[PDB]
Design an enzyme around this catalytic site. Structure first.
Site, mmCIF file in Angstrom:
data_model
loop_
_atom_site.group_PDB
_atom_site.id
_atom_site.type_symbol
_atom_site.label_atom_id
_atom_site.label_comp_id
_atom_site.label_asym_id
_atom_site.label_seq_id
_atom_site.Cartn_x
_atom_site.Cartn_y
_atom_site.Cartn_z
ATOM 1 N N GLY A 54 0.902 -1.215 -0.042
ATOM 2 C CA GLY A 54 -0.070 -0.059 -0.016
ATOM 3 C C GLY A 54 0.842 1.419 -0.004
ATOM 4 N N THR A 55 0.815 2.041 1.144
ATOM 5 C CA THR A 55 1.403 3.218 1.347
ATOM 6 C C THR A 55 1.414 4.077 -0.154
ATOM 7 N N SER A 56 2.776 4.411 -0.625
ATOM 8 C CA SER A 56 2.871 5.229 -1.911
ATOM 9 C C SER A 56 4.379 5.284 -2.199
ATOM 10 C CB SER A 56 2.180 6.422 -2.138
ATOM 11 O OG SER A 56 0.721 6.448 -1.696
ATOM 12 N N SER A 69 -0.573 3.830 -3.120
ATOM 13 C CA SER A 69 -1.869 4.336 -2.818
ATOM 14 C C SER A 69 -1.848 5.818 -2.904
ATOM 15 C CB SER A 69 -2.326 3.713 -1.467
ATOM 16 O OG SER A 69 -1.486 4.142 -0.695
#
EC number: 3.4.25.1
Lengths: 244, 250, 138, 243, 233, 205
Positions: F9-11, F138
């Site tokens: 996820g995260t980015s 994300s």
């Protein structure tokens, strides 16, 4: 014993493949041909033996290209080299396919010899009848190698294969000493044509045509192309005067 | 190309003999003499560590190798010929026994395998047999300790004690002199020390000599704790010291 | 060897620059580099002798010793070159004596080539051998 | 029958002549070379012989950097040379890829050792006439020297030399090591180790070397590598200072 | 001796030579004579159809692999048939794949290394036929010759099999004549007719024995036999 | 991203800048709502000066890394350091091939001396593109406008950092899947510099 000579992969009591040595027989048996690592680039030159009128000049062209930056020339079985040429012509795009980059000459090199070395590895795998002068401008500058059916090539500031090499060997070694500086491809172009005629003089007996090509980071712009037309005629006239 | 030799590279002599085999035992008999002794309390095998150079670090090679924690063997022959077999030998055991049986084979079957192997190396085309024969030390529960000699023929068979390689005969002689059913291992060890020293022309010491035993399961070597059932390897290689130790037990 | 002559000849003054006034290196650096262990133009041993003698006459035959001590160590132009100067040096140490005999005595086993064997020039290194012996005698 | 020499099959003696002849091909290049484990390092020196001007001499090495950590010197023909390094090249990343940590030096050796034994046993396969010595400073074993043969035979070395004159340096170092009594050259600067070596290479070869004379390489912790002619020259200079 | 060095195409002479090649090379001249030539406009084949008996038919030495491309043979027909078929694919293939005519040039490239594989590969043998190949294309009419050595060449004209030299010498003699005979297949042909007459020795060319083919600019590869050779006879 | 492997996820974002390129991403790896590893290191070395931002299946990328790295390594073991581009070329294949098995978007970022830093995107599409800077993962969504506006070329080393950090934090703020900590990795002539930033920092920017 004997028969060590017969089967390729065999180590003779001396630890040697005489077939390879016999291949070299066919190799030197090749038409004299040379190549020149020049300043930006390399230059490739070979006598084209004219056996008859019916020969359509300039059609049959010994030096073949790999990618566009890799020129190659060989003395030995023309089928051998071409066979290996495509074999090389493979690897580049192959390499270039994977690596997106056209292959470095040295990268491109070792590929070949290993493949060639295979042709050592089995008594049936008759090594190639060719040693091959090859190279070109790659990511860093030109490179010029000449590869033995052994699987031996090295970096060669100039190289010559075929019969008349020794006529050339000096000639190159000359320009080595004449031009430890370096040389414009065009002068290498000029010089070679001489050297070839000189190399040709070993073969001097019959008429011949002269194939010369080159890879000049300057002129071909990091590519391999053929010495052609006037600068060709120049180098010829240059040479054909200097042969006198 | 490839291999065009698919045909058995050893063939029945007009006498039916298989020369290469019969030639293998040559190089086999050539081997640095290696011994083994199946004692009551365990099994020990021994051979001299042959250094081709002091620069060469002798220990960096081992003419004896464990196969299963209760099984290791020695050879007489080409170290390389010794090399790859163990790998298979160890490997096959996991695969062809353990990974099936979740455990380490009875030495016999483990033995049986590599025997089969060399037979292939015997009969297969494009291959030669191996240049080693194998004194095999193993202990399994039901078969207890076990001492097996195997040839490049794959011919294998138990021993009470034995030796192979260069000087094996007079050793086996001395062994047969020495051997009893009741031989204790240290005895047998000392016996081997005696025995091997005989076949030892070069320097005789722990650093020059390779001794390994099938001892008791070695929980020190269990490498973990908290499992009662797993008591460690029976196979043990003795130290150069323990040798040099027992060399004073001479 | 033009520069080998010229740069020497250049150093000639350049030595005589600080010789008349070191420039010991002026002479030296030329052949020091050029010949070094690896000849560039090489030079004449003279170009090296030039150094040595411009060293010699100018410098301490004391220092010259230690100088040549090191010059010997790199190469020279050859196991020969300097040690001919080194030979005439011994006459000049004897053009010196006492301590310059002792300086010679220094030079003795500095490198054998005066009393003894590195070079084969025994026709000399034997001399100082006895020559110092003749003194060693005394 | 007499093919037993032509091929790998037990001689009447159980001997392999091609092997024995592959041994010929080993010094057939006639390059003498050494491997010395320094204290910290392992150092490998070899004869860089530049017969021709037309050569690009730079291109000439039998000492090959196998991995990050591992290099190797080859004794044998450059085709066969260029081969095994390639062969070696795979296993490392392979091993590393498979095993998450780099291949230990001997592993490669043992690995490559396996290889000829195959060809040894594999008739149509010819074994290779190169002698190979792998070196690194192993995360486990620190400085490391593993030489392998055309026979797949191999061992660890306190140090080694190899070449036609191998025995000479062999004696020399054996002399010096029986002298020095420790497996490794004890020097913290591989420089010294090199300088030690180039000495004892110059020593036993009785041979002064230019910087173009020497194929020189150093296995150091986490990095095997080599030197330019200048470190070589530095050594040549440095070694000229001890003497 | 040679039986040592000759027996295996994989095995060089001590001089580095493959006698099997040289042997295949022998079957070449063993083959019936046939002739070919090109103008820049047209490329002409002229063949000697040999029979077994008169009862038998006359072996045809000429092949059409393509409209722009067809060839003639001397030596072992079976090899070429493959090769021709093999080749036929290629022009097809190209014009299949690329809608592009195979370059008579690029054609010659193919069989060479293709032949080369026959050479370097133990257990096998070279092909037993060298080929004369006329083709016309974007680069014009091209007569190419192949060697079971793998070696190929474009010639203005040529002949092979037995004693082709007579034609050949004459052709090499004839050189500039026909190559400048342009849009005149007939004299391009009759040059060969004369040419083949030069290397005609045993008898004269006949309706049955003479075989002729031409590809040219607007001349597709087109074979002339019998009554087609009758007028040129 | 098969069911049962973890969700990063995260980015992930990387910016070539005046001295080179810097890689950045969150440390948060979620399983649905449940962050599996909040501290995960998602930036990855295929090569010393040639590196990657991994999105999509870790198990994809994680393996993918070993793959190309293995090759580059071997390639380097042969032909030396490939270009940063040359590495992505290796990826491109994998992606452009196994894409149907593959969930990986990847920013390929590496420092060449000659070309300085080199950003290369490889979305799951198997397409490959070089950029001045890259963002993915994300929260990349939220921050496109942000980054796009607030990006500049040859931003200094730090200018890159916090603008990225803001970019990330925004994503981290905005995204649920983006979080843990900001790891940045600087690729320059100087070399690899891994960075870390704690929420108590970048949350507030």
């Amino acid at each position: 014993g004997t028969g060590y000579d017969l089967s390729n992969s065999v180590f003779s009591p001396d630890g040697r493949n005489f077939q390879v040595e016999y291949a070299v027989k066919a190799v030197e048996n090749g038409t004299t041909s040379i190549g020149i690592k020049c300043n930006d680039g390399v230059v490739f030159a070979v006598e084209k033996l004219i056996t008859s009128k019916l020969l359509v000049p300039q059609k049959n062209v010994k030096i073949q290209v790999v990618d566009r930056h890799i020129g190659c020339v060989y003395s030995g079985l023309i089928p051998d080299g071409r066979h290996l040429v495509n074999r090389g012509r493979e690897e580049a795009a192959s390499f270039k396919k994977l690596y997106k980059t056209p292959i470095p000459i040295p990268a491109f090199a070792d590929r070949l010899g290993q493949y060639v070395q295979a042709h050592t590895l089995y008594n049936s795998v008759r090594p190639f009848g060719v040693s091959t002068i090859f190279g070109g401008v790659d990511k860093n500058g030109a490179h010029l190698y000449m590869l033995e059916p052994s699987g031996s090539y090295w970096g060669y500031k100039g190289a010559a294969t075929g019969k008349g090499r020794q006529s050339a060997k000096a000639e190159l070694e000359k320009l080595v000493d004449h031009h430890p500086e370096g040389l414009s491809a065009r002068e290498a172009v000029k010089q070679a044509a001489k050297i070839i005629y000189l190399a040709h003089e070993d073969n001097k007996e019959k008429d011949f045509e002269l194939e010369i090509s080159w890879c000049s980071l300057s002129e071909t712009n990091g590519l391999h192309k053929f010495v052609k037309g006037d600068l060709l005629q120049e180098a010829i006239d240059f040479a054909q005067k200097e042969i006198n | 190309m490839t291999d065009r030799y698919s045909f058995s590279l050893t063939t029945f002599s007009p006498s039916g003999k298989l020369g290469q085999i019969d030639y293998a035992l040559t190089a086999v008999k050539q081997g640095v003499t290696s011994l083994g002794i199946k004692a009551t309390n365990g099994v020990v095998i021994a051979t001299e560590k042959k250094s081709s150079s002091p620069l060469a670090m002798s220990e960096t090679l081992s003419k004896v190798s464990l196969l299963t924690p209760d099984i290791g063997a020695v050879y007489s022959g080409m170290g390389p010929d010794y090399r790859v077999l163990v790998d298979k030998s160890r490997k096959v055991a996991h695969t062809s026994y353990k990974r099936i049986y979740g455990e380490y084979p009875p030495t016999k079957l483990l033995v049986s395998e590599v025997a089969k192997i060399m037979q292939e190396a015997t009969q297969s085309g494009g291959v030669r047999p191996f240049g080693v024969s194998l004194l095999i030390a193993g202990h399994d529960e039901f078969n207890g300790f076990s001492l097996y000699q195997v040839d490049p023929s794959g011919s294998y068979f138990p021993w009470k004690a034995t030796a192979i390689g260069k000087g094996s005969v007079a050793a086996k002689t001395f062994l047969e002199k020495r051997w009893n059913d009741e031989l204790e291992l240290e005895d047998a060890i000392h016996i081997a020390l005696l025995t091997l020293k005989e076949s030892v022309e070069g320097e005789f010491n722990g650093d020059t000599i390779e001794l390994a035993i099938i001892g008791d399961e070695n929980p020190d070597l269990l490498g973990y704790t908290g499992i009662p059932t797993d008591k460690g390897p029976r196979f043990r290689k003795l130290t150069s010291q323990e040798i040099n130790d027992r060399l004073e037990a001479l | 060897a033009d520069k080998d002559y010229s740069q020497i000849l250049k150093e000639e003054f350049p030595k005589i620059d600080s010789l008349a006034q070191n420039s010991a290196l002026d002479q030296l650096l030329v052949l020091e580099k050029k010949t070094r262990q690896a000849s560039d133009l090489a030079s004449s041993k003279e170009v090296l002798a030039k150094i040595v003698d411009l060293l010699a006459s100018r410098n301490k035959w004391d220092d010259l010793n230690e100088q040549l001590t090191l010059l010997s160590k790199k190469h020279g132009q050859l196991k020969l070159s300097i040690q001919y100067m080194i030979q005439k040096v011994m006459e000049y140490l004897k053009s010196s004596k006492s301590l310059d005999l002792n300086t010679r005595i220094s030079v003795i086993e500095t490198i054998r080539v005066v009393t003894e064997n590195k070079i084969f020039v025994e026709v000399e290194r034997a001399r100082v051998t006895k020559d110092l012996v003749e003194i060693k005698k005394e | 029958a007499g093919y037993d020499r032509h091929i790998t099959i037990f001689s009447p003696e159980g001997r392999l002549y091609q092997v024995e002849y592959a041994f010929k091909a080993t010094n057939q290049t006639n390059i003498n070379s050494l491997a010395v484990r320094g204290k910290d390092c392992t150092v490998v020196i070899s004869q860089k012989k530049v017969p021709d001007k037309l050569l690009d001499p730079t291109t000439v090495s039998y000492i090959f950097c196998i991995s990050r950590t591992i290099g190797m010197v080859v004794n044998g023909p450059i085709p066969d040379a260029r081969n095994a390094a390639l062969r070696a090249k795979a296993e490392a990343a392979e091993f590393r890829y498979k095993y998450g940590y780099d291949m230990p030096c001997d592993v490669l050796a043992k690995r490559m050792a396996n290889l000829s034994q195959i060809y040894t046993q594999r008739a149509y396969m010819r074994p290779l006439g190169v002698i190979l010595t792998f070196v690194s400073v192993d995360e486990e074993l620190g400085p490391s020297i593993y030489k392998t043969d055309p026979a797949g035979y191999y061992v660890g070395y306190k140090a080694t030399a190899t070449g036609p004159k191998q025995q000479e340096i062999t004696t020399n170092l054996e002399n010096h090591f029986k002298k020095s009594k420790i497996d490794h050259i004890n020097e913290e600067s591989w420089e010294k180790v090199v300088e030690f070596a180039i000495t004892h290479m110059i020593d036993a070869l009785g041979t002064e070397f230019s910087k173009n004379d020497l194929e020189v390489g150093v296995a150091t912790k986490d990095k095997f590598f080599t030197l330019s002619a200048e470190n070589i020259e530095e050594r040549l200079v440095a070694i000229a200072e001890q003497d | 001796f040679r039986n040592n060095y000759d027996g295996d195409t994989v095995t060089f002479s001590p001089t580095g030579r493959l006698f099997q090649v040289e042997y295949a090379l022998e079957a070449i001249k063993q083959g019936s004579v046939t002739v070919g030539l090109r103008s820049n406009t047209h490329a002409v084949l002229v063949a000697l159809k040999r029979n077994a008996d008169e009862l038998s038919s006359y072996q045809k030495k000429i092949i059409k692999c393509d409209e722009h491309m067809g060839l003639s043979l001397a030596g072992l027909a079976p090899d070429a048939r493959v090769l021709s078929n093999y080749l036929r694919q290629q022009c097809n293939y190209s014009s299949l794949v690329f809608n592009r005519k195979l370059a008579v040039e690029r054609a010659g490239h193919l069989l060479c290394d293709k032949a080369q594989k026959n050479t370097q590969s133990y257990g096998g043998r070279p092909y037993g036929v060298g080929l004369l190949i006329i083709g016309y294309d974007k680069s014009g009419a091209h007569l190419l010759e192949f060697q079971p050595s793998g070696n190929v060449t474009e010639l203005y004209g040529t002949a092979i099999g037995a004693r082709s030299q007579g034609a050949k010498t004459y052709l090499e003699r004839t050189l500039d004549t026909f190559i400048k005979i342009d849009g005149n297949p007939d004299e391009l042909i009759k040059a060969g007719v004369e040419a083949i007459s030069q290397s005609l020795r045993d008898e004269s060319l006949t309706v049955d024995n003479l075989s002729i083919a031409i590809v040219g600019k607007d001349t597709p590869f087109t074979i002339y036999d019998g009554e087609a050779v009758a007028k040129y006879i | 991203l098969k069911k049962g492997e973890v969700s990063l996820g995260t980015s992930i974002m990387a910016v070539t800048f005046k001295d080179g390129v810097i890689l950045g991403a969150d440390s948060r790896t979620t399983t649905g709502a449940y962050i599996a590893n909040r501290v995960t290191d998602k930036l990855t070395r295929v090569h010393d000066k040639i590196w990657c931002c991994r999105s999509g299946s870790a198990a994809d990328t994680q393996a993918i890394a070993d793959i190309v790295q293995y090759h580059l390594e071997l390639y380097t073991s042969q032909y030396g350091t490939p270009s940063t581009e040359t590495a992505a070329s290796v990826f491109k294949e994998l992606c452009y091939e196994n894409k149907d098995n593959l969930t990986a978007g990847i920013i390929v970022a590496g420092y060449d001396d000659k070309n300085k830093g080199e950003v290369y995107t490889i979305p799951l599409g198997g397409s490959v593109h070089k950029l001045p800077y890259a963002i993915a993962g994300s929260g990349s969504t939220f921050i496109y406008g942000y980054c796009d506006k607030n990006f500049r070329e040859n931003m200094s080393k730090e200018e890159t950092v916090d603008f990225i950090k803001h970019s990330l934090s925004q994503a981290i703020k905005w995204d649920g899947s983006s979080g843990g900590v900001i790891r940045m990795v600087v690729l320059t002539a100087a070399g690899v510099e891994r960075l870390i930033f704690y929420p108590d920092e970048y949350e507030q920017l």
